[PDB]
Amino acid sequence: SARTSITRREYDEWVREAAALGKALRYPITEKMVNDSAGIVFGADQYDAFKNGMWSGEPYEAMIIFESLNEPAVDGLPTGAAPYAEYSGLCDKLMIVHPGKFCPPHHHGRKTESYEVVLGEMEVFYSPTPSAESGVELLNFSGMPVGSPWPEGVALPKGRESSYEKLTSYVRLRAGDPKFVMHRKHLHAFRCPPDSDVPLVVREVSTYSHEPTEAAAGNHAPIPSWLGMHDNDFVSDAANTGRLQTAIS
Amino acid sequence: SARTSITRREYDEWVREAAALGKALRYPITEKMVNDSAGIVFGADQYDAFKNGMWSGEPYEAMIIFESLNEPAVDGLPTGAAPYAEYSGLCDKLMIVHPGKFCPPHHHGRKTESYEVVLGEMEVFYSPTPSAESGVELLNFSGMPVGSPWPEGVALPKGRESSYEKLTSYVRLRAGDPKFVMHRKHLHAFRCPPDSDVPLVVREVSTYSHEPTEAAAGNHAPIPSWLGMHDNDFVSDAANTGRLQTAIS
Amino acid sequence: SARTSITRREYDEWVREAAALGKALRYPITEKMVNDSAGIVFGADQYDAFKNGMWSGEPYEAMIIFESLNEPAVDGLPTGAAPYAEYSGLCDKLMIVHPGKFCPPHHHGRKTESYEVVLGEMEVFYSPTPSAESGVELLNFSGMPVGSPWPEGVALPKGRESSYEKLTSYVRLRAGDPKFVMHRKHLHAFRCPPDSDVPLVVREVSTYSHEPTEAAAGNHAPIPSWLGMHDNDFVSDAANTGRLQTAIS
Amino acid sequence: SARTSITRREYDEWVREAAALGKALRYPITEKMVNDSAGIVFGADQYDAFKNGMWSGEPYEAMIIFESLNEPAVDGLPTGAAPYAEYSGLCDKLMIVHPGKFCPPHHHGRKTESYEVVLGEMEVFYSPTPSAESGVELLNFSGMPVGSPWPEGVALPKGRESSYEKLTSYVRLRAGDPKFVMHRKHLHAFRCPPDSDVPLVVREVSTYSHEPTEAAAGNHAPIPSWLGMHDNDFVSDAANTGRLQTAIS
Ligand SMILES: OC[C@@H]1O[C@@H](O)[C@@H](O)[C@H]1O
Ligand SMILES: OC[C@@H]1O[C@@H](O)[C@@H](O)[C@H]1O
Ligand SMILES: OC[C@@H]1O[C@@H](O)[C@@H](O)[C@H]1O
Ligand SMILES: OC[C@@H]1O[C@@H](O)[C@@H](O)[C@H]1O
Ligand SMILES: OC[C@@H]1O[C@@H](O)[C@@H](O)[C@H]1O
Ligand SMILES: OC[C@@H]1O[C@@H](O)[C@@H](O)[C@H]1O
Ligand SMILES: OC[C@@H]1O[C@@H](O)[C@@H](O)[C@H]1O
Ligand SMILES: OC[C@@H]1O[C@@H](O)[C@@H](O)[C@H]1O
Ligand SMILES: O[C@@H]1[C@H](O)[C@@H](O)OC[C@@H]1O
Ligand SMILES: O[C@@H]1[C@H](O)[C@@H](O)OC[C@@H]1O
Ligand SMILES: O[C@@H]1[C@H](O)[C@@H](O)OC[C@@H]1O
Ligand SMILES: O[C@@H]1[C@H](O)[C@@H](O)OC[C@@H]1O
Ligand SMILES: O[C@@H]1[C@H](O)[C@@H](O)OC[C@@H]1O
Ligand SMILES: O[C@@H]1[C@H](O)[C@@H](O)OC[C@@H]1O
Ligand SMILES: O[C@@H]1[C@H](O)[C@@H](O)OC[C@@H]1O
Ligand SMILES: O[C@@H]1[C@H](O)[C@@H](O)OC[C@@H]1O
Ligand SMILES: [Co+2]
Ligand SMILES: [Co+2]
Ligand SMILES: [Co+2]
Ligand SMILES: [Co+2]
């Protein structure tokens, strides 16, 4: 019975309700942002999230993202910043995670993010140690805070527990807290607590998001290198693939 | 009678009410963000805004800014991006402009901004033509849209009308609109309409904001060059000075 | 295939998402308010609303109601008001209607309501003529406004079109409008437009709501007569029954 | 220097900012609701609240009220309820109280209220004992909860401390709490804590509010008796007078 896709009705009710929730929270969601790419399921074996549904509280890797901005910010840059432009830019999006579900372990080589919880609470799991990039020196300034150890009893997705091993630091964010920064080159993941009465709704403000997705394939590249450039490295292999497209039957 | 400062009571009621308005709108305002640097008056001759008050509807250059984030985003960058890092980073802030008042004509060589109106309506005045930087070539991708001509009857601040001459393009932004981008090296200004029943409240998401201000003098510089680096170029000379400090008696 | 009930999963996702939407809108929803009585389906033949779902846009009679208050307001009343107390009291509730769905034609002999749209838009259908009560004289003061004729093309629920015949007046309410009053003894109904991108969310402030429901059977009666007193008269017979309980399988 | 009035500028900034705060919180405030009757000062000696201002945190009796509804609910009533109609009706309003300020001790013979905190926190002081009405028997059902004793260190307005003596019960209400009912014939008062970073904003849903005020003198009476009927009995004599009008110079 292992689900291999999500029905059109399951997808629409999930995404359309989330868009309404976002609008209720005053996030500027336009019509084009509500599409078949908004609802993400990280891997075929994660489609089972819909066996019992988004309110089951079960641990699965899936989420909704409504992106209001992803500005290259290339205009006005001295030509010499061409090779480093990919680390800048501005991406603003609203992310919705239901109870128990996760935005799976992953890291970005270029994108640095920041979180602002709007509704619910966000449990962030991450490695305070930055990853290295063979052959290249890297700058340091603030680095990541050590945080706290994981709380007891966190249910991880079946068959993906190991992908979380290195994300030893934990922090729980709430509405009204100071903005939290997730520096690039740091493994991170997050979920909405299983007992939450509401979906987790978080506003992410980060640098440009390099994603050669389906709802992406068609735009013009600001800088040659950017074309087909990917910057979302998921720890679990089964997550990097099913991420670029949602199977809707 | 030309006011030369703002009284402690005038300042607190202006800034504390604005902070409450921001909180009502769910913007994450922390205690340290509500300080004596939040309320800005651009020039001694602009203190007359307080002769009749922030609800007079009169044209003056003053505003409130609550900055929740100003992240250098230097961590994880290849050492080669050191000289171009100043063009990136992440700055999130809530700006409050009362009826008739303006965020005066100015431009940034490094900072690219984006606007999201939360409450009220925002009238943006800008030059669709980017400024040049002697001796350096610059990248181009999207540039700025031409916009529309100014609507009839815009009252400008007395003695500062000329600073607006080059900002020929106009656009009126409302809550729910697509995010609007103001590329770096473009002259821009904005105001809250004089007949607005509410202050204009806008969320700005931009690259790092280089400002060697009073509430700034004391931090550590992520990159040597950044120290004392200024990136807010106001057209009116009387605006670049009184911007770094508010005279409260 | 005519549905005869709603599955536990269908019910929970419908009601739990609505509760989250309400909370997003700051309505004070407590845990006990989110129960198996919140989601209402007016008649067995209306369960087909779940054949295609709450986002199908199809015309069916069903809605969600989260009641925060239903105060008899009997305390402090002179004993002589005992027989007229049933016309007073205070009932505050949040009602959520999905696109195309209706709160079916009905009237109350005692309850006078008022509407405040919080999200979406509300299309109210009603009779400007008050109903009569055989043998009893009634007071008049403001009466109901005549309103406008129905807009063209309103899709009514299959097999229930006639129940709307007498509700000739129409009015479309939006967020920010003046409070709208629906005097007792007036036939009324309302729906969320089929093309709405969001569920209709309305705050109703009315006099006491006499409803001997399932989630009601168990309380103490403030005044003898009130016991088992019903005040929700639906035009369609198939609506008065299936209203007191939702079949969840 | 004892202030004897409030200047036009002081009044407008106080009331216009409050209206904007209300709108930010989605309360349906129309243009006519923002008038010279919205800002209330209970007594000439309370005008000193403006010596240091609404953010001084000092104890004074003053508040702002934006009434969206005050429906007699007389239509549809059997003629026999004419003498008891004054106890019913529907009044919806948003009340704004700044830090340290109070809605002074008082009681209503007819009006029963309910509170829903929208922003900030509300400290309610009241007598759990209902007042008696010479010669008339009264109904009882739920009565008022006993509550808790006052917290230590509540600063009361100078010269009005005694008016609070009988309001022995205390309860602190927050956003999201169950609706709180204040039965008619109970002495009550409330304030916004002095250390609050935001004004207290509360939505009150009560029965009809009988107030022959300035912004009232001119309407038609639904029932003869109602004409000139007053239902706001303040413990302090200096409060019952200056309540019907605000001295603006
Ligand atoms: O609201 C837009 C539509 O809704 C979503 O379900 C997408 O399929 C898109 O086609
Ligand atoms: O609350 C929704 C329902 O309850 C959970 O147990 C899931 O199985 C889903 O079917
Ligand atoms: O809320 C913080 C205080 O309020 C503002 O007026 C600043 O002066 C700061 O000292
Ligand atoms: O609305 C506030 C008052 O009205 C305006 O005319 C200003 O002078 C200010 O004093
Ligand atoms: O949140 C409370 C639960 O949710 C609803 O589905 C009801 O069944 C109730 O049991
Ligand atoms: O948008 C939700 C889907 O679309 C509608 O057509 C319904 O059938 C439902 O299955
Ligand atoms: O917004 C309406 C005006 O504002 C308030 O100050 C009242 O004086 C009223 O005249
Ligand atoms: O915060 C506003 C100022 O501070 C308080 O002390 C008042 O005196 C007022 O003038
Ligand atoms: O051991 C816990 C978890 O199972 C692991 O994946 O990450 C660290 C945490 O403390
Ligand atoms: O857009 C998403 C966001 O930037 C964050 O959650 O990381 C994963 C993905 O890129
Ligand atoms: O002429 C108008 C204005 O006075 C000037 O400053 O900018 C262009 C606009 O059309
Ligand atoms: O912080 C402010 C913002 O970035 C924008 O308004 O430009 C001026 C100033 O820097
Ligand atoms: O004819 C329309 C509708 O079919 C009827 O039920 O109510 C009046 C409206 O104009
Ligand atoms: O609670 C509901 C509300 O009072 C209104 O919609 O009428 C029907 C029902 O009683
Ligand atoms: O004594 C305290 C207060 O001074 C009085 O007015 O009300 C009761 C409270 O406990
Ligand atoms: O309108 C106000 C409200 O009803 C409550 O605070 O009591 C005093 C006044 O009548
Ligand atoms: Co990420
Ligand atoms: Co700028
Ligand atoms: Co009704
Ligand atoms: Co009262």
Automatic annotation (TrEMBL), chains A, B, C, D:
Keyword terms, alphabetized: Isomerase
Keyword Metal-binding: no
GO MF annotations in UniProt: isomerase activity
Highest taxon, organism lineage: Bacteria
Keyword ATP-binding: no
Protein name per the record: L-Ribose isomerase
